[PDB]
Swiss-Prot record, chain A:
The gene is xpt. Its main location: cytoplasm. This is Xanthine phosphoribosyltransferase. Its EC number is 2.4.2.22. It is found in: Cytoplasm. Xanthine binds at residues 23, 30, 156.
Amino acid sequence: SNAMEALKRKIEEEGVVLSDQVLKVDSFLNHQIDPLLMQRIGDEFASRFAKDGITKIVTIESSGIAPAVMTGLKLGVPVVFARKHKSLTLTDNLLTASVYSFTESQIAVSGTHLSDQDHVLIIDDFLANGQAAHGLVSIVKQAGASIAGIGIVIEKSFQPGRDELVKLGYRVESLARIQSLEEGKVSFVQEV
Amino acid sequence: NAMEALKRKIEEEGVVLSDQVLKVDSFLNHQIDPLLMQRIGDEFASRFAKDGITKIVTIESSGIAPAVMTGLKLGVPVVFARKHKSLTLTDNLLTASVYSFTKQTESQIAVSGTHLSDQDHVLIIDDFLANGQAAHGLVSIVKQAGASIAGIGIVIEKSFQPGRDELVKLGYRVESLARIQSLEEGKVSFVQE
Ligand code: NA
Ligand code: NA
Ligand code: NA
Ligand code: NA
């Protein structure tokens, strides 16, 4: 009945394990979007960061946008999405970060929409190797803003992304934590 | 209402570039105002509340937020077309060619047919309507799936450009929340319809 249970159900029902490293969730998160699920997700992120003085959400196009906007809606704050490609109006005050895929690409945000007055919640769909998250952290730091934490819809706990961010002192709130995709099945991190 | 809130936001925060491009990065195209998006989504939902919509189709990236807010209110899933290769986008791909009048180039957009049924009755949602090519692209993809089009919801329409008339001529219901008559001398004039 909570967002974590709903999300785990969806992953169990509709997620397709493609390999040891890849989970396909195109039916609800990455191509088709379940807006009601996104609202529950946003409400859960908002609940976790309710008392933390969030002024702004930062995410990256495209899959991050829906959970980010639902979080922004609940908290009553604006949402900024970083861009991966040249666009028509993203032309000045560019804050950029290099992101390499396991080669390298640039992501960008206009500093016009981020100030040192901001206390930012980063929201993203997947946490795997963590390079995009590090990039968003860099961009927020470049703006002189502080980071309240990182909200992730699906985390692959068996990849290094989470540990890197935690080591750097960041609060990581992952709604689904996957321990393994071995044997073509999703195994979640154990809960007591 | 949503239209008036949008119009005020455009007037107060929009910047006219080169007397013809409307920059609205503070609330629509880079920074997103979620509350305004929800109001926008609710208005689109109200206009199509009696159309038996089963699904919304949009295109990354700026179309996603108003589309998802519309889908939330209507209680329907939202499918966003892709402009670039995705890790898992590989099955049943339905593609359309999109021409750019402004840069005289063509690009390919894609949707997996797995998320589009011949039983679907689709509402297309997009942020801008100008020359209309992405909209025609989405129409094509929906038709390729054998699905029907209930209409097209647009946040900002540049009414002096031919996109709207092209879609309307073909019999599509176009619902534009802010209709821009002109951007000349660096200011926004709305259609008084
Ligand atoms: Na992402
Ligand atoms: Na992703
Ligand atoms: Na668009
Ligand atoms: Na646009």
